[PDB]
Amino acid sequence: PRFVSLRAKQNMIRRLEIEAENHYWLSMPYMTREQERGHAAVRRREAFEAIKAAATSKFPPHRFIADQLDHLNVTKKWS
Amino acid sequence: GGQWRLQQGLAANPSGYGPLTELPDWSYADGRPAPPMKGQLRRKAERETFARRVVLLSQEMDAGLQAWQLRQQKLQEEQRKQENA
Amino acid sequence: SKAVTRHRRVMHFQRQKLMAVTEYIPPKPAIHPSCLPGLIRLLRREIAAVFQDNRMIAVCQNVALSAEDKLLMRHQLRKHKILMKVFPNQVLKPFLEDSKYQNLLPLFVGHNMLLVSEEPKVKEMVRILRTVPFLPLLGGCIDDTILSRQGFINYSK
Amino acid sequence: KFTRSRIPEKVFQASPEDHEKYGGDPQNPHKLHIVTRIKSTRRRPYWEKDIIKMLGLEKAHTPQVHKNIPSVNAKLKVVKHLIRIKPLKLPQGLPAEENMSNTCLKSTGELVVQWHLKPV
RNA sequence: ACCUCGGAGCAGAACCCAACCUCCGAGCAGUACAUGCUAAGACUUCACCAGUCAAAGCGAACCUCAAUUGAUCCAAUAACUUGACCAACGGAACAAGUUACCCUAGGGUAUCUACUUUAUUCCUCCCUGUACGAAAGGACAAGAGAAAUAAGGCCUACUUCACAAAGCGCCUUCUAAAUGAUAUCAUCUCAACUUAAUACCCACACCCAAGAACAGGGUU
RNA sequence: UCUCUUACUUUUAACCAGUGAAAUUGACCUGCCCGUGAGGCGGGCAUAACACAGCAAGACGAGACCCUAUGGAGCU
RNA sequence: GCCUGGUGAUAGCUGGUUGUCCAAGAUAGAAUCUUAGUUCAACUUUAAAUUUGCCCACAGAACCAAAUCCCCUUGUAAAUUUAACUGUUAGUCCAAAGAGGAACAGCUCUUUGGACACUAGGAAAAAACCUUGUAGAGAGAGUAAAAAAUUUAACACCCAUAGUAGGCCUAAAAGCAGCCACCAAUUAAGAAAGCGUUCAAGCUCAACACCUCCCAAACAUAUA
RNA sequence: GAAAUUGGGCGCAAUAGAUAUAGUACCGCAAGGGAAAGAUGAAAAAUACCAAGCAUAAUAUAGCAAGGACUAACCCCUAUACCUUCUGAUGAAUUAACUAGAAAUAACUUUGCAAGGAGAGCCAAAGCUAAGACCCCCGAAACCAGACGA
Ligand SMILES: [Mg+2]
Ligand SMILES: [Mg+2]
Ligand SMILES: [Mg+2]
Ligand SMILES: [Mg+2]
Ligand SMILES: [Mg+2]
Ligand SMILES: [Mg+2]
Ligand SMILES: [Mg+2]
Ligand SMILES: [Mg+2]
Ligand SMILES: [Mg+2]
Ligand SMILES: [Mg+2]
Ligand SMILES: [Mg+2]
Ligand SMILES: [Mg+2]
Ligand SMILES: [Mg+2]
Ligand SMILES: [Mg+2]
Ligand SMILES: [Mg+2]
Ligand SMILES: [Mg+2]
Ligand SMILES: [Mg+2]
Ligand SMILES: [Mg+2]
Ligand SMILES: [Mg+2]
C-alpha cells in the first residue's frame, strides 16, 4: 500500500498544464495538408542523394611509397 | 530559484545565456582581450546553425505557399480558358 | 490476478495518482449560504360565530381532570345551555384582536376551555367547583366588560 | 492490450477562452514551433522512442525548431506528453546574413537577432 | 487420456498466436476418362521438405468435397507404374517386464554468536450455618489450621552416612462514585470539576566451612 | 529401571611439567529486536579491551525420496 | 575379484577455461526416441554492393472494442541485396486483453507494450514500480521522481373517551387467532402500528390542548 | 576406399626433460603399482634485500573492513564478499610452481603473374599462386582380451 502526497499531486498537475498548452499550440497549423504537399521534396531528395552518394563512394585508401620507405628510419643513427 | 528567472525572461539556470557565462573570464593585464573560450565558440556555432535552420524552414514555408498559389491561379486559368470555342 | 477480482485490486501507482488528482472538488461560495437571510378558517368562522353568540363568557384551566370527570363536568354543564370549548390559543390570540378585545389579550394562554353562555348558571357552576379544591375561575368578559373572579362572585351571586 | 492511441480532433480545437489564456491568434498563426524533450523515452513504447529520434529530441532540455505543418504536427501529437511546445516568436525579423552569428534564443520563446551582453 | 490432418471459439477488424483449453470432424466417396502436354507470373502454415493458384501456348471439346494423408532407401515390374494403422503419422529395416541389490552422471575432540545466581493452590474450621433471601437456601473478607507444590536455605534430630555431602528430614516464603452541562428534567463525563519498593550488597608461605585455574576468607 | 535421586572409589577432569595430532577453515574489525528478502541490508536499541571453565539455542556442518540420460548392469 | 592392455574408452551431464582497452549486441518459431540436446529460421555481428527504409493521408480491406494492414506527403537516416560465420531462447515481473485454476498462489498458458538480465536518483530495505539513460575531471548551477490522509450514531414533553366486548367463524378470542367493512361522536384518539393476556383488564404509537520486544524522534500557529 | 598409370636443434634444464640418483625405497600374497631429492669456491691440505608463516610489536565502542576524507589511526558519512549455476546454492586456509582452442575447403586481406597461373599432376568464362587469419581441459558406471590370485 502506497499513498499519494501533495508533492505527487502538484507534480502531476504541472505536467498536465504543460500538456494542455501543448494541445493549444497544436490546434492552429500554418498550412493545410494540401498546401504543404511537395513543399520540401527537393531538399529531401538531395539529402538522400547525399546519403546514397556517401554509401556508394567507399573504397580502400591510397598506398604511398613514402610510408613504406619511411619505415627504414627505425635504424636511423648518428655519425 | 529559477522559476523567478523565467518570469524575468532570464535563463532558468544562471549558467545559461547572459552575462555570467558569455563574457570572457579574463584578459591580459595590458588590456589585450583573451582568445575566446572553447565553450563560447561551441555555443556560438550551435546558435548559428539554429538560426540557419530557422531561416531555412521559414523560407521553405513561404515558397511552399507561393507555389500553391500558382497552382490555384493556374487551375482557375485552366478553368476559364476551357469554357470557350 | 484477473481484471475482475473479489477484493478491490491494488491500482498501479500512476493510476492511483490520476484518481487522486481528478477527485471531485465542490464549489465554495465566498459566504456560507446558511449565514445569510381550511381547518384554520373553520376555527375562524366557528369561534368567530361564538364571539357574536355569547353575551357572557368565562374560562378555566380545564386540564386538571379525568375523562369520566370531564364527562361529569360536561353533563352538569349540559344541564345548562352553557358550552365548553377546547380550542388552540394559537389561533385565539389573533381572534381577540379581531374581536377588539384589548383587555382580553392577556387572558388566553396555556390549557383553557371556553364556557360561552347567555344565561348565568355560573354561580351553580362555582357550586360544582367548590367541591373540588383546584381548577380556579379565570376571568371572563360579559358584553365588552371584564369579569374578575370577584366580579364572578358579584354577578354570579 | 496496450496499443497505440488515436486522439480525437475535438482535443485539438481551441476555444476563445484558450485564446484568452495563452497568447494565440487563430487568424495568422505561428510558423515555427520550439519543441523540447522534458520527459524520458524510457518506459515509453518503441514508437514514441522513434518519433523522438525523428524530431531530433534525443537530448532533453534542448530546443528544436519545427514547422507548424500537419505532418510535423502529427508526429508531435504522438509524443505530446514527452515534449513542450511553444511558438517561435520573432520580435525583430528573421536573421539576415549580417545578424546570423549574433543571435540568441531567449527563454520567453523569442529569438533575438542582436545579442549584446550589456545592460539596457 | 493422447501423439497426424482439417473447421469454429480463444484470437471481435491484415497475417500470426498457446494449453492434459472449449466444441465439431478426417484417414473417403462420387463423376469423368484431354484427371493431355507445356508455360509467364504468384501464394505458402512462420525454416526446410512438402503444399497450393495460374494467364498465354500446342492439342482437343464446343472435376465436387475441407480434411480425405506418408519422405528416403529398398523391393516388385520389360516398361508405365505399384508398395506401410512406417497412426509414435519428418517415418531406426527388425528389440518386452523388472531391480527394497540396482550402479554411475546430474537435477530438485565446540571455532564464532548467545547464555551460565532477575510465592501459589487445595482441604478443614471460624466469622456463621449470620449477612442476603421470604422458605428452600446460604456469603464474604479477615482469621486460625493441616497439606501439597514451587522458591530459598539448613543438618539438631531421623535416614543414606559419619571431621562432611545429602533427602525421604527440617526451616522460611511479604476503574467506581457523587455532582452535573451540551439538551436548564435526567445523564458514570472520548463535558468540565471533586473523590478513591522495601530488603541484599557497599573498606611469601600455610590453613580454609573459599575454590577447576585465578580469585576470596583466616594466620594474634 | 522408576518415584527421585544420593554418597563414595577409580578413570576422566582441571592445574603444573615433557611430548605433541586431526576433521575444519573465502575474508572477518564475527551483537540484540522488528522488518525485508539475516552477525552483515533498512529502522530502532546496545556497545572499553582481554583470557580461563562450562552450556549447546543458533551459525558452520551422511542416510533417504523423486525425476532425467536416445548412461550402464543384473534378473525373468 | 584384482591387475595390465584396448584407453586420452565414452559422457547431449557436472566442474573449469589464464594480458589490456574500445566498439556492436537479448526473447518469433518449425521439426526431432524431442523438450538437460541439435538442425533450420528469427534475432545478432563484420565486410561489400546498391537504393530506399522508417514515420505515414485521402482512398481501400465480409458476409455470417482498443486497434491493425495499406499508404503519398512530411520528419528523418536508414534499409535491402551480396559474402562469411558464431552465439541466444521454459525468460522473469508489471500494465492491458484473455484461457485453466478457487475471479488462490512468488500457480499454469497465450497476446500487446514496458522494464530487468546495461546507469544513476527515488519508493525503508528493494532484478521487474516511478524518474533517468552514452559514459572523463570540478570543493559550480538548474531540475526530475520523491514525505499518506482520516475519528464516527442523544432526542420530540404530553396524551388517549365514546357507537363497542365491530359483525362472522370461534368455548370467547373484543384493534390486537383469521375473513371483510373499515363509517362514525364531540374539537379530537386508527374498528388500530408495536407489548400484553385462553379471553379479558392493563402498557406504548399516530391524533387532540403548550409549541522473542512497541517500533524513527517528534510536532496542530512565521507568508511556497 | 583402390588400381592401371606417374616417378644437428627459434628442444627441456631438477614440479621441466626419461619413471629414473632407481624400476631402487615403499606398497601388494601375487600379476603389478611405483617415489622423492642436488646446487660453496681456483683451492676446504683456505670453514645481504624477496612468498606464505612468524618475531621485533596483543588488544579499545561500530559492524565485507574499505572509500570520501581529515589537524588527527579510530570516531562522521557512503558502501548486501568473489567465482559459477539458475529469469534474478557451488567452490576456494594461504603461498609458490604447474594447469585448458590443435584443422586453412570456401569467403576476406595482402603480394606476384595475369587469359592465364603453378618448380609436371591442378584449377581457369579474371583467374591462379603464395601468405596471414577458425575450431579446449578434467571427471563415470562400464565392455572386451590376456595374466595374477583359495
Ligand atoms: Mg513461410
Ligand atoms: Mg515419433
Ligand atoms: Mg513425429
Ligand atoms: Mg600440557
Ligand atoms: Mg529474521
Ligand atoms: Mg553469514
Ligand atoms: Mg569459551
Ligand atoms: Mg547409450
Ligand atoms: Mg571426456
Ligand atoms: Mg550425450
Ligand atoms: Mg556499447
Ligand atoms: Mg523418430
Ligand atoms: Mg539432451
Ligand atoms: Mg510506398
Ligand atoms: Mg618423472
Ligand atoms: Mg614475508
Ligand atoms: Mg558506520
Ligand atoms: Mg574468473
Ligand atoms: Mg591354496
mmCIF file with all atom_site columns, all heavy atoms in Angstrom, chain E residues 134-140:
data_model
loop_
_atom_site.group_PDB
_atom_site.id
_atom_site.type_symbol
_atom_site.label_atom_id
_atom_site.label_alt_id
_atom_site.label_comp_id
_atom_site.label_asym_id
_atom_site.label_entity_id
_atom_site.label_seq_id
_atom_site.pdbx_PDB_ins_code
_atom_site.Cartn_x
_atom_site.Cartn_y
_atom_site.Cartn_z
_atom_site.occupancy
_atom_site.B_iso_or_equiv
_atom_site.pdbx_formal_charge
_atom_site.auth_seq_id
_atom_site.auth_comp_id
_atom_site.auth_asym_id
_atom_site.auth_atom_id
_atom_site.pdbx_PDB_model_num
ATOM 1   P P     . A E 1 134 ? -37.303 -11.396 51.162 1.00 0.00 ? 134 A E P     1
ATOM 2   O OP1   . A E 1 134 ? -38.720 -11.509 50.716 1.00 0.00 ? 134 A E OP1   1
ATOM 3   O OP2   . A E 1 134 ? -36.670 -10.046 51.200 1.00 0.00 ? 134 A E OP2   1
ATOM 4   O "O5'" . A E 1 134 ? -37.134 -12.059 52.611 1.00 0.00 ? 134 A E "O5'" 1
ATOM 5   C "C5'" . A E 1 134 ? -38.176 -11.876 53.617 1.00 0.00 ? 134 A E "C5'" 1
ATOM 6   C "C4'" . A E 1 134 ? -38.907 -13.175 53.884 1.00 0.00 ? 134 A E "C4'" 1
ATOM 7   O "O4'" . A E 1 134 ? -39.561 -13.626 52.666 1.00 0.00 ? 134 A E "O4'" 1
ATOM 8   C "C3'" . A E 1 134 ? -38.060 -14.368 54.360 1.00 0.00 ? 134 A E "C3'" 1
ATOM 9   O "O3'" . A E 1 134 ? -38.775 -15.166 55.298 1.00 0.00 ? 134 A E "O3'" 1
ATOM 10  C "C2'" . A E 1 134 ? -37.827 -15.135 53.056 1.00 0.00 ? 134 A E "C2'" 1
ATOM 11  O "O2'" . A E 1 134 ? -37.479 -16.496 53.200 1.00 0.00 ? 134 A E "O2'" 1
ATOM 12  C "C1'" . A E 1 134 ? -39.197 -14.963 52.412 1.00 0.00 ? 134 A E "C1'" 1
ATOM 13  N N9    . A E 1 134 ? -39.185 -15.232 50.979 1.00 0.00 ? 134 A E N9    1
ATOM 14  C C8    . A E 1 134 ? -38.605 -14.504 49.971 1.00 0.00 ? 134 A E C8    1
ATOM 15  N N7    . A E 1 134 ? -38.735 -15.052 48.789 1.00 0.00 ? 134 A E N7    1
ATOM 16  C C5    . A E 1 134 ? -39.430 -16.229 49.040 1.00 0.00 ? 134 A E C5    1
ATOM 17  C C6    . A E 1 134 ? -39.879 -17.264 48.199 1.00 0.00 ? 134 A E C6    1
ATOM 18  N N6    . A E 1 134 ? -39.692 -17.277 46.882 1.00 0.00 ? 134 A E N6    1
ATOM 19  N N1    . A E 1 134 ? -40.541 -18.296 48.777 1.00 0.00 ? 134 A E N1    1
ATOM 20  C C2    . A E 1 134 ? -40.733 -18.275 50.102 1.00 0.00 ? 134 A E C2    1
ATOM 21  N N3    . A E 1 134 ? -40.356 -17.359 50.989 1.00 0.00 ? 134 A E N3    1
ATOM 22  C C4    . A E 1 134 ? -39.703 -16.353 50.387 1.00 0.00 ? 134 A E C4    1
ATOM 23  P P     . A E 1 135 ? -38.035 -16.244 56.236 1.00 0.00 ? 135 A E P     1
ATOM 24  O OP1   . A E 1 135 ? -38.650 -16.185 57.592 1.00 0.00 ? 135 A E OP1   1
ATOM 25  O OP2   . A E 1 135 ? -36.559 -16.055 56.125 1.00 0.00 ? 135 A E OP2   1
ATOM 26  O "O5'" . A E 1 135 ? -38.442 -17.644 55.566 1.00 0.00 ? 135 A E "O5'" 1
ATOM 27  C "C5'" . A E 1 135 ? -37.481 -18.743 55.553 1.00 0.00 ? 135 A E "C5'" 1
ATOM 28  C "C4'" . A E 1 135 ? -38.059 -19.946 54.840 1.00 0.00 ? 135 A E "C4'" 1
ATOM 29  O "O4'" . A E 1 135 ? -38.756 -19.526 53.638 1.00 0.00 ? 135 A E "O4'" 1
ATOM 30  C "C3'" . A E 1 135 ? -37.054 -20.980 54.321 1.00 0.00 ? 135 A E "C3'" 1
ATOM 31  O "O3'" . A E 1 135 ? -36.616 -21.888 55.321 1.00 0.00 ? 135 A E "O3'" 1
ATOM 32  C "C2'" . A E 1 135 ? -37.876 -21.687 53.239 1.00 0.00 ? 135 A E "C2'" 1
ATOM 33  O "O2'" . A E 1 135 ? -38.740 -22.668 53.768 1.00 0.00 ? 135 A E "O2'" 1
ATOM 34  C "C1'" . A E 1 135 ? -38.692 -20.538 52.651 1.00 0.00 ? 135 A E "C1'" 1
ATOM 35  N N9    . A E 1 135 ? -38.142 -19.977 51.415 1.00 0.00 ? 135 A E N9    1
ATOM 36  C C8    . A E 1 135 ? -37.573 -18.739 51.254 1.00 0.00 ? 135 A E C8    1
ATOM 37  N N7    . A E 1 135 ? -37.192 -18.485 50.028 1.00 0.00 ? 135 A E N7    1
ATOM 38  C C5    . A E 1 135 ? -37.518 -19.635 49.328 1.00 0.00 ? 135 A E C5    1
ATOM 39  C C6    . A E 1 135 ? -37.353 -19.995 47.978 1.00 0.00 ? 135 A E C6    1
ATOM 40  N N6    . A E 1 135 ? -36.800 -19.198 47.066 1.00 0.00 ? 135 A E N6    1
ATOM 41  N N1    . A E 1 135 ? -37.782 -21.225 47.603 1.00 0.00 ? 135 A E N1    1
ATOM 42  C C2    . A E 1 135 ? -38.338 -22.019 48.528 1.00 0.00 ? 135 A E C2    1
ATOM 43  N N3    . A E 1 135 ? -38.543 -21.788 49.823 1.00 0.00 ? 135 A E N3    1
ATOM 44  C C4    . A E 1 135 ? -38.108 -20.564 50.169 1.00 0.00 ? 135 A E C4    1
ATOM 45  P P     . A E 1 136 ? -35.118 -22.471 55.308 1.00 0.00 ? 136 A E P     1
ATOM 46  O OP1   . A E 1 136 ? -34.980 -23.457 56.418 1.00 0.00 ? 136 A E OP1   1
ATOM 47  O OP2   . A E 1 136 ? -34.159 -21.329 55.251 1.00 0.00 ? 136 A E OP2   1
ATOM 48  O "O5'" . A E 1 136 ? -35.004 -23.235 53.905 1.00 0.00 ? 136 A E "O5'" 1
ATOM 49  C "C5'" . A E 1 136 ? -35.628 -24.537 53.740 1.00 0.00 ? 136 A E "C5'" 1
ATOM 50  C "C4'" . A E 1 136 ? -35.554 -24.949 52.286 1.00 0.00 ? 136 A E "C4'" 1
ATOM 51  O "O4'" . A E 1 136 ? -36.239 -23.972 51.460 1.00 0.00 ? 136 A E "O4'" 1
ATOM 52  C "C3'" . A E 1 136 ? -34.149 -25.025 51.684 1.00 0.00 ? 136 A E "C3'" 1
ATOM 53  O "O3'" . A E 1 136 ? -33.517 -26.262 51.976 1.00 0.00 ? 136 A E "O3'" 1
ATOM 54  C "C2'" . A E 1 136 ? -34.445 -24.843 50.194 1.00 0.00 ? 136 A E "C2'" 1
ATOM 55  O "O2'" . A E 1 136 ? -34.882 -26.032 49.575 1.00 0.00 ? 136 A E "O2'" 1
ATOM 56  C "C1'" . A E 1 136 ? -35.569 -23.809 50.225 1.00 0.00 ? 136 A E "C1'" 1
ATOM 57  N N9    . A E 1 136 ? -35.109 -22.426 50.105 1.00 0.00 ? 136 A E N9    1
ATOM 58  C C8    . A E 1 136 ? -35.033 -21.488 51.107 1.00 0.00 ? 136 A E C8    1
ATOM 59  N N7    . A E 1 136 ? -34.585 -20.324 50.708 1.00 0.00 ? 136 A E N7    1
ATOM 60  C C5    . A E 1 136 ? -34.342 -20.498 49.352 1.00 0.00 ? 136 A E C5    1
ATOM 61  C C6    . A E 1 136 ? -33.857 -19.626 48.355 1.00 0.00 ? 136 A E C6    1
ATOM 62  N N6    . A E 1 136 ? -33.514 -18.358 48.580 1.00 0.00 ? 136 A E N6    1
ATOM 63  N N1    . A E 1 136 ? -33.739 -20.119 47.098 1.00 0.00 ? 136 A E N1    1
ATOM 64  C C2    . A E 1 136 ? -34.088 -21.393 46.875 1.00 0.00 ? 136 A E C2    1
ATOM 65  N N3    . A E 1 136 ? -34.555 -22.300 47.729 1.00 0.00 ? 136 A E N3    1
ATOM 66  C C4    . A E 1 136 ? -34.665 -21.789 48.968 1.00 0.00 ? 136 A E C4    1
ATOM 67  P P     . G E 1 137 ? -32.294 -26.332 53.016 1.00 0.00 ? 137 G E P     1
ATOM 68  O OP1   . G E 1 137 ? -31.563 -27.612 52.799 1.00 0.00 ? 137 G E OP1   1
ATOM 69  O OP2   . G E 1 137 ? -32.777 -26.023 54.392 1.00 0.00 ? 137 G E OP2   1
ATOM 70  O "O5'" . G E 1 137 ? -31.369 -25.109 52.561 1.00 0.00 ? 137 G E "O5'" 1
ATOM 71  C "C5'" . G E 1 137 ? -30.361 -25.332 51.545 1.00 0.00 ? 137 G E "C5'" 1
ATOM 72  C "C4'" . G E 1 137 ? -30.408 -24.226 50.519 1.00 0.00 ? 137 G E "C4'" 1
ATOM 73  O "O4'" . G E 1 137 ? -31.514 -23.327 50.791 1.00 0.00 ? 137 G E "O4'" 1
ATOM 74  C "C3'" . G E 1 137 ? -29.186 -23.307 50.486 1.00 0.00 ? 137 G E "C3'" 1
ATOM 75  O "O3'" . G E 1 137 ? -28.105 -23.858 49.750 1.00 0.00 ? 137 G E "O3'" 1
ATOM 76  C "C2'" . G E 1 137 ? -29.773 -22.051 49.846 1.00 0.00 ? 137 G E "C2'" 1
ATOM 77  O "O2'" . G E 1 137 ? -29.888 -22.180 48.444 1.00 0.00 ? 137 G E "O2'" 1
ATOM 78  C "C1'" . G E 1 137 ? -31.151 -21.993 50.503 1.00 0.00 ? 137 G E "C1'" 1
ATOM 79  N N9    . G E 1 137 ? -31.196 -21.225 51.746 1.00 0.00 ? 137 G E N9    1
ATOM 80  C C8    . G E 1 137 ? -31.594 -21.698 52.971 1.00 0.00 ? 137 G E C8    1
ATOM 81  N N7    . G E 1 137 ? -31.539 -20.797 53.920 1.00 0.00 ? 137 G E N7    1
ATOM 82  C C5    . G E 1 137 ? -31.068 -19.654 53.285 1.00 0.00 ? 137 G E C5    1
ATOM 83  C C6    . G E 1 137 ? -30.802 -18.360 53.804 1.00 0.00 ? 137 G E C6    1
ATOM 84  O O6    . G E 1 137 ? -30.935 -17.947 54.965 1.00 0.00 ? 137 G E O6    1
ATOM 85  N N1    . G E 1 137 ? -30.341 -17.497 52.812 1.00 0.00 ? 137 G E N1    1
ATOM 86  C C2    . G E 1 137 ? -30.155 -17.836 51.495 1.00 0.00 ? 137 G E C2    1
ATOM 87  N N2    . G E 1 137 ? -29.696 -16.877 50.684 1.00 0.00 ? 137 G E N2    1
ATOM 88  N N3    . G E 1 137 ? -30.403 -19.048 51.002 1.00 0.00 ? 137 G E N3    1
ATOM 89  C C4    . G E 1 137 ? -30.857 -19.905 51.946 1.00 0.00 ? 137 G E C4    1
ATOM 90  P P     . G E 1 138 ? -26.757 -24.297 50.508 1.00 0.00 ? 138 G E P     1
ATOM 91  O OP1   . G E 1 138 ? -25.949 -25.173 49.616 1.00 0.00 ? 138 G E OP1   1
ATOM 92  O OP2   . G E 1 138 ? -27.108 -24.796 51.870 1.00 0.00 ? 138 G E OP2   1
ATOM 93  O "O5'" . G E 1 138 ? -25.965 -22.927 50.753 1.00 0.00 ? 138 G E "O5'" 1
ATOM 94  C "C5'" . G E 1 138 ? -25.898 -21.920 49.711 1.00 0.00 ? 138 G E "C5'" 1
ATOM 95  C "C4'" . G E 1 138 ? -25.768 -20.567 50.364 1.00 0.00 ? 138 G E "C4'" 1
ATOM 96  O "O4'" . G E 1 138 ? -27.051 -20.186 50.925 1.00 0.00 ? 138 G E "O4'" 1
ATOM 97  C "C3'" . G E 1 138 ? -24.818 -20.501 51.561 1.00 0.00 ? 138 G E "C3'" 1
ATOM 98  O "O3'" . G E 1 138 ? -23.452 -20.337 51.212 1.00 0.00 ? 138 G E "O3'" 1
ATOM 99  C "C2'" . G E 1 138 ? -25.373 -19.301 52.326 1.00 0.00 ? 138 G E "C2'" 1
ATOM 100 O "O2'" . G E 1 138 ? -24.956 -18.070 51.777 1.00 0.00 ? 138 G E "O2'" 1
ATOM 101 C "C1'" . G E 1 138 ? -26.876 -19.504 52.148 1.00 0.00 ? 138 G E "C1'" 1
ATOM 102 N N9    . G E 1 138 ? -27.489 -20.272 53.230 1.00 0.00 ? 138 G E N9    1
ATOM 103 C C8    . G E 1 138 ? -27.867 -21.590 53.188 1.00 0.00 ? 138 G E C8    1
ATOM 104 N N7    . G E 1 138 ? -28.386 -22.028 54.309 1.00 0.00 ? 138 G E N7    1
ATOM 105 C C5    . G E 1 138 ? -28.341 -20.929 55.155 1.00 0.00 ? 138 G E C5    1
ATOM 106 C C6    . G E 1 138 ? -28.767 -20.806 56.499 1.00 0.00 ? 138 G E C6    1
ATOM 107 O O6    . G E 1 138 ? -29.277 -21.665 57.231 1.00 0.00 ? 138 G E O6    1
ATOM 108 N N1    . G E 1 138 ? -28.540 -19.523 56.988 1.00 0.00 ? 138 G E N1    1
ATOM 109 C C2    . G E 1 138 ? -27.991 -18.494 56.266 1.00 0.00 ? 138 G E C2    1
ATOM 110 N N2    . G E 1 138 ? -27.866 -17.331 56.918 1.00 0.00 ? 138 G E N2    1
ATOM 111 N N3    . G E 1 138 ? -27.582 -18.597 55.000 1.00 0.00 ? 138 G E N3    1
ATOM 112 C C4    . G E 1 138 ? -27.790 -19.843 54.506 1.00 0.00 ? 138 G E C4    1
ATOM 113 P P     . A E 1 139 ? -22.315 -20.762 52.263 1.00 0.00 ? 139 A E P     1
ATOM 114 O OP1   . A E 1 139 ? -21.040 -21.013 51.533 1.00 0.00 ? 139 A E OP1   1
ATOM 115 O OP2   . A E 1 139 ? -22.865 -21.843 53.130 1.00 0.00 ? 139 A E OP2   1
ATOM 116 O "O5'" . A E 1 139 ? -22.195 -19.456 53.178 1.00 0.00 ? 139 A E "O5'" 1
ATOM 117 C "C5'" . A E 1 139 ? -21.037 -18.603 53.039 1.00 0.00 ? 139 A E "C5'" 1
ATOM 118 C "C4'" . A E 1 139 ? -21.276 -17.571 51.963 1.00 0.00 ? 139 A E "C4'" 1
ATOM 119 O "O4'" . A E 1 139 ? -22.245 -16.587 52.412 1.00 0.00 ? 139 A E "O4'" 1
ATOM 120 C "C3'" . A E 1 139 ? -20.042 -16.744 51.594 1.00 0.00 ? 139 A E "C3'" 1
ATOM 121 O "O3'" . A E 1 139 ? -19.251 -17.395 50.611 1.00 0.00 ? 139 A E "O3'" 1
ATOM 122 C "C2'" . A E 1 139 ? -20.668 -15.452 51.068 1.00 0.00 ? 139 A E "C2'" 1
ATOM 123 O "O2'" . A E 1 139 ? -21.066 -15.566 49.720 1.00 0.00 ? 139 A E "O2'" 1
ATOM 124 C "C1'" . A E 1 139 ? -21.885 -15.289 51.977 1.00 0.00 ? 139 A E "C1'" 1
ATOM 125 N N9    . A E 1 139 ? -21.646 -14.460 53.157 1.00 0.00 ? 139 A E N9    1
ATOM 126 C C8    . A E 1 139 ? -21.718 -14.901 54.453 1.00 0.00 ? 139 A E C8    1
ATOM 127 N N7    . A E 1 139 ? -21.463 -13.983 55.347 1.00 0.00 ? 139 A E N7    1
ATOM 128 C C5    . A E 1 139 ? -21.212 -12.849 54.593 1.00 0.00 ? 139 A E C5    1
ATOM 129 C C6    . A E 1 139 ? -20.881 -11.536 54.969 1.00 0.00 ? 139 A E C6    1
ATOM 130 N N6    . A E 1 139 ? -20.741 -11.152 56.233 1.00 0.00 ? 139 A E N6    1
ATOM 131 N N1    . A E 1 139 ? -20.685 -10.633 53.979 1.00 0.00 ? 139 A E N1    1
ATOM 132 C C2    . A E 1 139 ? -20.827 -11.038 52.708 1.00 0.00 ? 139 A E C2    1
ATOM 133 N N3    . A E 1 139 ? -21.137 -12.246 52.239 1.00 0.00 ? 139 A E N3    1
ATOM 134 C C4    . A E 1 139 ? -21.321 -13.122 53.241 1.00 0.00 ? 139 A E C4    1
ATOM 135 P P     . C E 1 140 ? -17.860 -18.105 50.986 1.00 0.00 ? 140 C E P     1
ATOM 136 O OP1   . C E 1 140 ? -16.994 -18.100 49.772 1.00 0.00 ? 140 C E OP1   1
ATOM 137 O OP2   . C E 1 140 ? -18.145 -19.409 51.647 1.00 0.00 ? 140 C E OP2   1
ATOM 138 O "O5'" . C E 1 140 ? -17.209 -17.155 52.097 1.00 0.00 ? 140 C E "O5'" 1
ATOM 139 C "C5'" . C E 1 140 ? -16.226 -16.164 51.704 1.00 0.00 ? 140 C E "C5'" 1
ATOM 140 C "C4'" . C E 1 140 ? -16.947 -14.900 51.317 1.00 0.00 ? 140 C E "C4'" 1
ATOM 141 O "O4'" . C E 1 140 ? -17.670 -14.380 52.465 1.00 0.00 ? 140 C E "O4'" 1
ATOM 142 C "C3'" . C E 1 140 ? -16.074 -13.718 50.893 1.00 0.00 ? 140 C E "C3'" 1
ATOM 143 O "O3'" . C E 1 140 ? -15.652 -13.837 49.545 1.00 0.00 ? 140 C E "O3'" 1
ATOM 144 C "C2'" . C E 1 140 ? -17.043 -12.547 51.087 1.00 0.00 ? 140 C E "C2'" 1
ATOM 145 O "O2'" . C E 1 140 ? -17.905 -12.379 49.982 1.00 0.00 ? 140 C E "O2'" 1
ATOM 146 C "C1'" . C E 1 140 ? -17.878 -12.993 52.299 1.00 0.00 ? 140 C E "C1'" 1
ATOM 147 N N1    . C E 1 140 ? -17.587 -12.224 53.551 1.00 0.00 ? 140 C E N1    1
ATOM 148 C C2    . C E 1 140 ? -17.802 -12.735 54.848 1.00 0.00 ? 140 C E C2    1
ATOM 149 O O2    . C E 1 140 ? -18.196 -13.902 55.011 1.00 0.00 ? 140 C E O2    1
ATOM 150 N N3    . C E 1 140 ? -17.543 -11.948 55.925 1.00 0.00 ? 140 C E N3    1
ATOM 151 C C4    . C E 1 140 ? -17.116 -10.691 55.768 1.00 0.00 ? 140 C E C4    1
ATOM 152 N N4    . C E 1 140 ? -16.878 -9.973  56.858 1.00 0.00 ? 140 C E N4    1
ATOM 153 C C5    . C E 1 140 ? -16.918 -10.143 54.475 1.00 0.00 ? 140 C E C5    1
ATOM 154 C C6    . C E 1 140 ? -17.170 -10.926 53.417 1.00 0.00 ? 140 C E C6    1
#
